[PDB]
Amino acid sequence: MNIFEMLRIDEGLRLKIYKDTEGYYTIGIGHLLTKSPSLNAAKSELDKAIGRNTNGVITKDEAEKLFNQDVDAAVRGILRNAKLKPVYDSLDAVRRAALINMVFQMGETGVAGFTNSLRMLQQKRWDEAAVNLAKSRWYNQTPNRAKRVITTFRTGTWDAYK
Secondary structure, three states: OOHHHHHHHHHOOEEEEEEOOOOOEEEEOOEEOOOOOOHHHHHHHHHHHHOOOOOOEOOHHHHHHHHHHHHHHHHHHHHOOOOHHHHHHHOOHHHHHHHHHHHHHHHHHHHHOOHHHHHHHHOOOHHHHHHHHHOOHHHHHOHHHHHHHHHHHHHOOOHHHO
16 A cells, blocks of 8 residues: 555546535646636646646546646655655654545645644654544545545554455
8 A cells, every 4th residue: 555546546537527525626636726616617627737638537547647646746845845844754664654645635735734733743642642633624525535544644554454
């Protein structure tokens, strides 16, 4: 198990524009296109992302290309963020993947706002951090995925994904 397989499990794969859990236009492996309610706006974002005039449909190769970019972007987002980088640095490789997962899902700014949870994680108070992470809109809107990520933070194992 690794961060790519982990996120493939949590995000799934769809080759045509669709709406994610928040109702936002998305494609591929959880690649958010826009928060705009306009499908045309979403299609324009897609054309720009891929580099060609699409029909709202991409290939698997193109989906995996955006995925690679997006995972790299989540890591870059962590490392340039002054609140997230120290937490990431303090973590083992399995829990580092759980933090990348969170940033992939809700963005650098979103995760950096989890101040109290981040502190508990850096203190390695795993059960307490797990309880704190669940006290969130994130957990309430996507509880099964949040549970998997939180179990990964709690145990430092891949038990939730195997």
